Amino acid sequence: ALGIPVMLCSTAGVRDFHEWYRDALFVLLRHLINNPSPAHGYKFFTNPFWTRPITGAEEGLFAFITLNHLSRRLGEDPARSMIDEYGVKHSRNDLAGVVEVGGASAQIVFPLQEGTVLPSSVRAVNLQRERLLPERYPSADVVSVSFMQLGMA
Amino acid sequence: DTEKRINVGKTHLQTLRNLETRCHDSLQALVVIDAGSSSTRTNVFLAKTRSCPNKGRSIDPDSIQLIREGKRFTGLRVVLEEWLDTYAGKDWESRPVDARLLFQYVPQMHEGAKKLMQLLEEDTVAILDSQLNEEQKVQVKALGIPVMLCSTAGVRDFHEWYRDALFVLLRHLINNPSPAHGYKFFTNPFWTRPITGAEEGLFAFITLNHLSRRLGEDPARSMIDEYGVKHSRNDLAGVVEVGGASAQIVFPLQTVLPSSVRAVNLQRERLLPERYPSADVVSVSFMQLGMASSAGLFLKELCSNDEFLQGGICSNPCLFKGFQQSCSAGEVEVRPDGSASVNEDVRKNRLKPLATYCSVHNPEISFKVTNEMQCRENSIDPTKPLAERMKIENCSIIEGTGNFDKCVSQVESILVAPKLPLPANIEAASSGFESVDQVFRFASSTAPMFITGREMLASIDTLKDHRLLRSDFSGDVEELAEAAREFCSSEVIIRTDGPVIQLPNARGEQKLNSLNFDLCKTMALTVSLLRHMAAGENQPSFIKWEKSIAGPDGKPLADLGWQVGVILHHVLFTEEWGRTAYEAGYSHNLE
Amino acid sequence: DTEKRINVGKTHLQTLRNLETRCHDSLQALVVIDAGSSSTRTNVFLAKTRSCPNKGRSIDPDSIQLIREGKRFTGLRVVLEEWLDTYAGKDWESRPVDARLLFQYVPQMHEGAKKLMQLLEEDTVAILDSQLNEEQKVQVKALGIPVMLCSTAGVRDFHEWYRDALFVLLRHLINNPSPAHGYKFFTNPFWTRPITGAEEGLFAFITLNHLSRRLGEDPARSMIDEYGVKHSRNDLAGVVEVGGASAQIVFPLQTVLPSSVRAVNLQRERLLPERYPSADVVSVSFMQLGMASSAGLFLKELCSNDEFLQGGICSNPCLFKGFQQSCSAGEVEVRPDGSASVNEDVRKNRLKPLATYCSVHNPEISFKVTNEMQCRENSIDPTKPLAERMKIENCSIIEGTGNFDKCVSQVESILVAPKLPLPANIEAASSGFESVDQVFRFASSTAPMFITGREMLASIDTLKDHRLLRSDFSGDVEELAEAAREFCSSEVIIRTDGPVIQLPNARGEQKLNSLNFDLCKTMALTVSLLRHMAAGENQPSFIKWEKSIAGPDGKPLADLGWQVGVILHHVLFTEEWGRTAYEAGYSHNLE
Ligand SMILES: Nc1ncnc2c1ncn2[C@@H]1O[C@H](COP(=O)(O)NP(=O)(O)O)[C@@H](O)[C@H]1O
Ligand SMILES: Nc1ncnc2c1ncn2[C@@H]1O[C@H](COP(=O)(O)NP(=O)(O)O)[C@@H](O)[C@H]1O
Ligand SMILES: [Mg+2]
Ligand SMILES: [Mg+2]
């Protein structure tokens, strides 16, 4: 009755794929998901926001969110976060970083401790500013990097 | 008779009831501090705000008009470089410097930044006081003045934590103005921040299309189809902006792009709100391609080539016959006696930012081999000291040969299509473009193009004024190439009044100055740019060279650039602008 | 050593970065102009505002504290009545008046309203200047002062278009303050408007529960169940407010009600935002039941009954033995020689608003028979002139009999449970309540009750002070009835210093004044109110008599009434308050 949102995201496999072919395949994939078999009854659906090729850094940022969510480090509630005298919400426990090595790539993701001043060349990502986490969640400046040719295969 | 007296009292109540229900318009001043490469100047704008009951307050985008562009004060690079000279020690460019130790000099960096900010505040207040009446002044002082200081190519390539640390101090200086003047200036990390080359170009595109009435959400500038999608009435025009240190190439797609080419959607990347028509725009900026930066790099590369440097004399095809200057990239001044004096000051040298970047002590060169090879291709040795880097080895005098065809082929191989990308262009390389030639080979559009830049306009105007080019000139490369070929083959004769450029076949003459002496290099840049634009799969409908765009009154309401774009980028998001500019406002800074 | 110097500079940048990210607190003044029946006074409140980056500005509800209640200036009724005396002609109450003709006197109504508004502004500024430091003054003057002028029972029953026309002029006067003082006062039709009796009571309920920490959205004052429904931690307490012209009975339902009884849901009727706990509250207000209004009506009805009026002498059971006053509802002053002087001034008479309403020339009586019969039941003849209406026919002196039981039975039949509803009570009749007795017979709740009103408190306090009632007193009617029966049977003896009330059986004594002489009428009102409260299906957990509620500091932050409630009613709707108070603000009034 509610419908099944589908999120097909390609990783390192077709990240380095030449010409238009990869992005053209994604338009076709979404159409295939949006038109499922009416026999089973399961109402599958997608959009260009859910089904799209995710970047190496994006892949790493989601791996960070997954880790901190399951380990109960990330949260908005008073059990996982705290609001100071200046209305700024801080996480009760330290946000943990991740190192994920897959088939084709390796991700190195870690949050910076109270905005560690970085050089002009180093481009860090703020979770709330880059719309990864909503305003109600505690703020964190995270360095997310992925390296091709580092995966096991 | 008595009924009319009753109607006066009824109107008295109706007029008073109107005020309670109607929207009241107030005047607000908006400040954009252009922290460019050459200088840091203030831009004072006026806009009409509309406050409606239960609807809030919002700026009318079409009411945005520039009052005046302020004095050209010290650039942010000079500010940071003096701080390094005074605290890290002189000639820090040739020595390895520990950045960790420089943290004990942050209040010292703040005191140096205070010097420039007090001058900009004094200048901003001067513009406001002289160009506003007492009624307007009350309105402006009551609403507060949002300030947007954005650094461009001047400190884009700046090393270490320094640049971003200076910005935190700059915001604090703006948020604490002089209480004497009454003008309530205020800022935040969203308004005052270093803007990327792509951002600089995107805002320049918004400015162009806004003033030319191409961009808009109203039914006069946009149309909604049967499927609820809003399309713009007229084609969105692209822009080519060549500043002091960088050149921007921006155009909307009217197109399937490769995986490597990363285009920007205005609504998805939150540049324009959802209510505005959607457009996928390619925005690219090239460092070492601005008027000052390209001048230093061209002279360095050309006067290192054995095809031009012979017996200490570098033969410059971009300079007029009879013209000669000292072999250095220093600031050229054309003296009244016909001579060209080259400034010896290391900071007033056009190679300084490139030689400071291309240093083995900069972590961007010592750790990254790709960047080291980029510097070496432009003859710059990062291992050698700063003085040796800017030095044109075995060269004393630069002699002008006036060969335009040779000048084109050189600008082509050096600036337009080089072997490796020009230094500090990782931002352009990430979007999928190593050089200017790659832009049109990978991405092309039929969208009309606009050419912006003081010297870019001067190049076309000079040829139009001397009747070499038609007044009704399109993007005809052959017409431009032949007209410039005749003009650049002119002889310089030192006359009784001063240096005069004499056109061949007794066509005409004009005075030689510190701005037009190397106009032929900019002319060659235009030719090679239009050549690559013509080479593309899709060619623009028309190419236009305009100084400013006339408004409904006839007078141009604002100048072309990123200024209006950055205002629109924040003001158009109604809910978000209302909170930061009016709900929080200058009252947020109350201690 | 050197690492600590580096850390100072690192902290310098961290502290500066905190300011850019953190929420800054500013102080704002809030003005509530109580346009009551007896007078028009200003209430100056202070509150802490919080501005957060990208989140906007909002008032902390628990930071709201009253500075001072201003001087008791001219009531809005007197203002309108003088305008009618001067433009429609004197004794307009006894003559038919054409309302259409009075429209030519709107600027004249504005000039009269300007007189009062300049005094209130002068008084408001005086409170602010004397009770704020220079730092606080800057914050207050920069944010702007929202003004909420709400008229109560004084002009609730006012005839024709006049009252609503005056309000349009009042808002214009507030929106245009003196520029000399610097305090930026501003209003709108949402803040400055005539509040209904039910609204007056609902805001009094919000005030009570806010200060007593019963109402709140935080986990300290509220709890969320497994089904996402937020419930209040402690039971929401009801209120009984007896002012100058009206009495309010407000209580939350903790209940299935008949179709005729129309209860108000706080979230559905937009009194409290969705985030606050839900409550269905019964709010009812009765005209002719306030301290001044009930005094005039009681004397009129009692001294028309042949059971009390005999040979020109009306025997008053609510007045002490030995006390005597002239037979009129005029303002009673207890002179130092023991005598009670009754004011002859027609406006300074307690029957004036009832006699002005109960006029055959008022469209509410001439067209509506139901209202005409209501007036006649209270002995008022709408056909007869104003002087004859307020006149107690065939009566010269009022003699006090001091019989409390007889005083209760009379207040009961006259004010609590009359044959027809008291005049101008269509608002109460629409909700399903003709009289005070009907309130508890149709709607009952176990919710604790609070009693508010100067004389209501004085009634219980006097008995506690003379040791007739326990210090730990609940809503025990028998305890109160016996204590008052002894106190009201006291003899008045004119002593050497002045008039003194002497308690029976040598219990004690106190000085007789213009406030306590008729305290026994208010005592009878309390008895009959608690009797009907006990008669109800559901009885309140406890009945409390409190002057003010102590805050966290120990000092009461604000007084009980509709003032804090009306502030909370607007300030708690974050998005809506931010737009009207900060986005629009005083800057909306800029001409
Ligand atoms: N008075 C003036 N009017 C118009 N243009 C003027 C001027 N003085 C210098 N200029 C020109 O502006 C340019 C300044 O560009 P910048 O904004 O400093 N360079 P970027 O950081 O954006 O790459 C220079 O190329 C210079 O030739
Ligand atoms: N100084 C004073 N302090 C406290 N209460 C005072 C006072 N002077 C008069 N009062 C009392 O306030 C009441 C004023 O009520 P109002 O608000 O004028 N009447 P309504 O329109 O709300 O029905 C009077 O009953 C009077 O006894
Ligand atoms: Mg610039
Ligand atoms: Mg009142």
CB contact under 8 A, A86 and C10: no
- Ligand nearest to the backbone CA of C291: 2
- Helix/strand/coil (H, E, C) string of B461-499? HHHHHCCCCCCCCCCCHHHHHHHHHHHCCCEEEECCCCE
**CATH number for the domain harbouring residue B91:** 3.30.420.530
Q: Write out chain A residues lying below 8 Å of C21, CB-based.
A: 88, 139
A22 to chain B, any CB pair closer than 8 A? The answer is: yes
Give the number of other Cβ atoms within 10 Å of residue A43's Cβ. 12
Q: Determine contact, residues C114/C173, Cβ cutoff 8 Å.
A: yes
> Is the domain of C448 the same as that of C390?
yes
Q: Write out chain B residues lying below 8 Å of C52, CB-based.
A: 584
Residues ≥6 apart with Cβ < 8 Å to C400: C316, C318, C319, C320, C321, C322, C323, C324, C492
Q: Write out chain C residues lying below 8 Å of B171, CB-based.
A: 20
Distance CA(A14)–CA(A22), nearest Å, equals: 7
> Is the domain of B141 the same as that of B224?
no
| CA nearest neighbour of C303 among C396, C420, C419, C406 | C396
Angle B209-B210-B214 (CA atoms, 0-180°, nearest 5)?
A: 50
Give the number of other Cβ atoms within 10 Å of residue B226's Cβ. 5
A126 to chain C, any CB pair closer than 8 A? The answer is: no
CA atoms within 13 A on the CB side of A5: 7
| Phi, then psi, of C36 in degrees rounded to 5 | -70, -170
Residues in chain C: 591
Tell me how close the Cα of B160 comes to any Cα of chain A, in angstroms: 4
Distance CA(B36)–CA(B40), nearest Å, equals: 6
CB contact under 8 A, A135 and C18: no
Distance CA(C28)–CA(C49), nearest Å, equals: 7
Q: In what order do the strands lie in the sheet with A141-148?
A: A98-101, A105-111, A141-148, A125-126
> Is the domain of B290 the same as that of B326?
yes
Q: Is the distance from the beta carbon of residue C246 to the nearest atom of ligand 2 less than 6 Å? A: yes
Q: Determine contact, residues B27/B67, Cβ cutoff 8 Å.
A: no
Burial of B554 (0-12, 13-18, 19+ CB in 10 A): exposed
Residues ≥6 apart with Cβ < 8 Å to A129: none
Q: Which residues of C542-554 are buried (b: 16+ CB within 10 A; e: fewer)?
A: ebebeeebeeeee
| Alpha helices per DSSP H over C417-518 | 426-430, 436-442, 454-465, 477-487
Q: Is the distance from the beta carbon of residue B290 to the nearest atom of ligand 1 less than 6 Å? A: yes
Distance CA(B223)–CA(B235), nearest Å, equals: 12
- Kindly state the DSSP code that residue B177 receives in the 8-state scheme: -
Q: Determine contact, residues C61/C570, Cβ cutoff 8 Å.
A: no
Q: What tokens does A114 get?
A: 């109270």
| CA nearest neighbour of C460 among C345, C352, C545, C344 | C545
Give the number of other Cβ atoms within 10 Å of residue B227's Cβ. 5
Distance CA(C341)–CA(C10), nearest Å, equals: 79
> Is the domain of C487 the same as that of C537?
yes
Tell me how close the Cα of C4 comes to any Cα of chain B, in angstroms: 9
Distance CA(C271)–CA(C202), nearest Å, equals: 8
CB contact under 8 A, B160 and A120: yes
Q: Is the distance from the beta carbon of residue B361 to the nearest atom of ligand 1 less than 6 Å? A: no
What spacing in Å lies between the alpha carbon of C152 and ligand 4's midpoint? 5
What single letter denotes the amino acid at residue C103? Answer: F
What spacing in Å lies between the alpha carbon of B334 and ligand 1's midpoint? 19
One DSSP character per residue, C543-557 reads: EEE-SB---SSSS-S
A134 to chain C, any CB pair closer than 8 A? The answer is: no
| CA nearest neighbour of C580 among B219, C569, C591, C198 | C569
CB contact under 8 A, C22 and A87: yes
Indicate the residue of B161, B257, B426 with minimum beta-carbon distance to A119: B161
Tell me how close the Cα of B349 comes to any Cα of chain A, in angstroms: 24
Q: Determine contact, residues A61/A142, Cβ cutoff 8 Å.
A: yes
Q: Where are the beta strands (DSSP E) in B130-260?
A: 145-151, 185-186, 222-224, 230-232, 238-242, 246-252
- Kindly state the DSSP code that residue A113 receives in the 8-state scheme: T
| CA nearest neighbour of C206 among C466, C574, C560, C454 | C560
Residues ≥6 apart with Cβ < 8 Å to B518: B295, B318, B319, B332
Q: Determine contact, residues C32/B184, Cβ cutoff 8 Å.
A: no
> Is the domain of B536 the same as that of B420?
yes
Q: Determine contact, residues B231/B266, Cβ cutoff 8 Å.
A: no
Q: C454-465 vs C519-535: helix axis angle to the nearest 10?
A: 100
Q: Determine contact, residues B423/B371, Cβ cutoff 8 Å.
A: yes
Which numbered atom of ligand 1 lies nearest the CA of B200?
22
Distance CA(B507)–CA(B466), nearest Å, equals: 8
CB contact under 8 A, B57 and C583: yes
What single letter denotes the amino acid at residue B315? Answer: S
Catalytic positions of B? 200
Integer distance in angstroms from the first to the last C-alpha of chain C? 61
A90 to chain C, any CB pair closer than 8 A? The answer is: no
| Phi, then psi, of B367 in degrees rounded to 5 | -100, -30
| CA nearest neighbour of A95 among A109, A114, A74, A116 | A74
Q: Which residues of C404-417 are buried (b: 16+ CB within 10 A; e: fewer)?
A: bebbbebbbebbbb
Distance CA(B31)–CA(B145), nearest Å, equals: 7
CB contact under 8 A, A120 and B163: yes
Cα dihedral across residues B35, B39, B44, B47: positive or negative? negative
Tell me the helix, strand and coil percentages in chain A, rounded to 5: 20, 20, 60
What single letter denotes the amino acid at residue B146? Answer: P
> Is the domain of C232 the same as that of C378?
yes
> Is the domain of C347 the same as that of C390?
yes
| CA nearest neighbour of B432 among A27, A18, A23 | A18
- C200 belongs to the catalytic site: yes
Place of tokens 């002289």: B130
Distance CA(C187)–CA(C170), nearest Å, equals: 10
Integer distance in angstroms from the first to the last C-alpha of chain A? 42
Distance CA(B133)–CA(C61), nearest Å, equals: 41
- Kindly state the DSSP code that residue B63 receives in the 8-state scheme: G
CB contact under 8 A, B259 and A22: yes
Q: Is the distance from the beta carbon of residue B75 to the nearest atom of ligand 1 less than 6 Å? A: no
CB contact under 8 A, B51 and C587: yes
Distance CA(B209)–CA(C579), nearest Å, equals: 31
> Is the domain of C470 the same as that of C437?
yes
Give the number of other Cβ atoms within 10 Å of residue A153's Cβ. 7
> Is the domain of C183 the same as that of C268?
no
Burial of B522 (0-12, 13-18, 19+ CB in 10 A): buried
How many domains are there within chain B? 2
Q: Write out chain A residues lying below 8 Å of B100, CB-based.
A: none
Q: Is the distance from the beta carbon of residue B146 to the nearest atom of ligand 1 less than 6 Å? A: no
Q: Determine contact, residues B263/B257, Cβ cutoff 8 Å.
A: yes
> Is the domain of C76 the same as that of C130?
yes
Distance CA(C267)–CA(C229), nearest Å, equals: 13
CA C148 to chain centre: 15
Q: In what order do the strands lie in the sheet with B309-310?
A: B309-310, B313-316, B397-400, B324-326, B340-342, B332-334
Q: Write down the catalytic residue from C199, C200, C241, C364.
A: C200
Residues ≥6 apart with Cβ < 8 Å to B484: B404, B459, B463, B468, B520, B523, B524, B527
Distance CA(A5)–CA(B453), nearest Å, equals: 50
Q: Determine contact, residues B399/B312, Cβ cutoff 8 Å.
A: no
Distance CA(B87)–CA(B69), nearest Å, equals: 33
| CA nearest neighbour of B526 among B511, B545, B507 | B545
Q: Which of A11, A117, A145 is the best substitution to test chain B (most B C-beta atoms within 10 A)?
A: A117
What single letter denotes the amino acid at residue B265? Answer: N
Tell me how close the Cα of A88 comes to any Cα of chain C, in angstroms: 6
- C8 is in which domain, residue-wise? 1-195+560-591
User: Ligand 2, atom 5: nearest CA belongs to which residue?
Assistant: C454
SS3 label, residue B252: strand
Q: Which of A86, A112, A121, A141 is the best substitution to test chain B (most B C-beta atoms within 10 A)?
A: A121
A88 to chain C, any CB pair closer than 8 A? The answer is: yes
Place of tokens 């690492």: C3
CB contact under 8 A, C579 and B54: yes
Q: Write out chain B residues lying below 8 Å of C578, CB-based.
A: 579, 583
Distance CA(C41)–CA(C505), nearest Å, equals: 44
> Is the domain of B499 the same as that of B478?
yes
Q: Write out chain B residues lying below 8 Å of C580, CB-based.
A: 53-54
| CA nearest neighbour of B291 among B351, B348, B244 | B244
| Phi, then psi, of B338 in degrees rounded to 5 | 95, -20
Which numbered atom of ligand 1 lies nearest the CA of B293?
23
Place of tokens 């500019």: B581
Q: Determine contact, residues B263/B474, Cβ cutoff 8 Å.
A: no
Place of tokens 């080479």: B535
Q: Where are the beta strands (DSSP E) in C229-345?
A: 230-232, 238-242, 246-252, 264-265, 280-287, 309-310, 313-316, 324-326, 332-334, 340-342
User: Ligand 2, atom 25: nearest CA belongs to which residue?
Assistant: C244
Distance CA(C361)–CA(C92), nearest Å, equals: 9
Q: Is the distance from the beta carbon of residue C61 to the nearest atom of ligand 2 less than 6 Å? A: no
Q: In what order do the strands lie in the sheet with C264-265?
A: C264-265, C280-287, C246-252, C238-242, C449-452, C543-545
Angle B306-B310-B315 (CA atoms, 0-180°, nearest 5)?
A: 85
- Ligand nearest to the backbone CA of C245: 2
| CA nearest neighbour of C299 among C288, C284, C283 | C288
Choosing from B239, B284, B454, B516 the residue with most ligand 1 atoms within 8 A of its CB, the one to mutate for a pocket test is B454
Burial of B274 (0-12, 13-18, 19+ CB in 10 A): exposed
Place of tokens 């899709």: B538
| CA nearest neighbour of A132 among A47, A34, A44, A63 | A63
Place of tokens 């500090």: B424
CA C222 to chain centre: 28
Q: Which residues surround ligand 3, an ion (CB under 5 A)?
A: B 36, 152, 243
**CATH number for the domain harbouring residue C516:** 3.30.420.540
Angle C520-C524-C528 (CA atoms, 0-180°, nearest 5)?
A: 170
Distance CA(C78)–CA(C155), nearest Å, equals: 10
> Is the domain of C116 the same as that of C15?
yes
Distance CA(A121)–CA(A140), nearest Å, equals: 19
Radius of gyration of chain A (CA): 18
Indicate the residue of C17, C23, C54 with minimum beta-carbon distance to A86: C23
**Alpha-carbon separation of residue B87 from A18, B63, B90, B345, B352 (angstroms):** 49, 46, 8, 20, 20
Catalytic positions of A? 59
Residues ≥6 apart with Cβ < 8 Å to C245: C36, C37, C38, C152, C153, C154, C156, C287, C288, C290, C292, C293, C353
Q: Determine contact, residues B95/B85, Cβ cutoff 8 Å.
A: no
Q: Write out chain C residues lying below 8 Å of A116, CB-based.
A: none
Q: Write out chain C residues lying below 8 Å of A131, CB-based.
A: none
Q: Determine contact, residues C211/C558, Cβ cutoff 8 Å.
A: yes
CB contact under 8 A, A88 and C54: no
- List the beta bridge partners of residue B45: B30, B66
Tell me how close the Cα of B159 comes to any Cα of chain A, in angstroms: 6
| CA nearest neighbour of C201 among C274, C235, C252, C163 | C252
One DSSP character per residue, B71-136 reads: --B--HHHHHHHHHHHHT-TTTTSS---GGGGGGGHHHHHHHHHHHHHHHHHHHHHHHHHS--HHH
Experimental technique for the deposited model: X-ray
Q: Determine contact, residues B521/B298, Cβ cutoff 8 Å.
A: yes
Q: In what order do the strands lie in the sheet with B499-502?
A: B491-494, B499-502, B509-511
Q: What tokens does C349 get?
A: 């008479």
**Alpha-carbon separation of residue B513 from B323, B498, B500, B591, C6 (angstroms):** 11, 10, 9, 53, 50
Q: Is the distance from the beta carbon of residue B152 to the nearest atom of ligand 1 less than 6 Å? A: yes
**Alpha-carbon separation of residue C389 from C230, C297, C359, C361, C365 (angstroms):** 54, 11, 9, 13, 14
| Phi, then psi, of C434 in degrees rounded to 5 | -80, -40
Angle B5-B10-B14 (CA atoms, 0-180°, nearest 5)?
A: 145
| Alpha helices per DSSP H over B488-559 | 519-535
SS3 label, residue C400: strand
| CA nearest neighbour of B84 among B156, B193, B166 | B166
CA C302 to chain centre: 26
Distance CA(B477)–CA(B524), nearest Å, equals: 11
Integer distance in angstroms from the first to the last C-alpha of chain B? 61
- List the beta bridge partners of residue B249: B240, B284
CB contact under 8 A, A135 and C54: yes
Distance CA(B576)–CA(A135), nearest Å, equals: 13
**Alpha-carbon separation of residue B2 from B11, C88, C183 (angstroms):** 14, 15, 42
Q: What tokens does C325 get?
A: 């006053």
Tell me how close the Cα of C23 comes to any Cα of chain A, in angstroms: 5
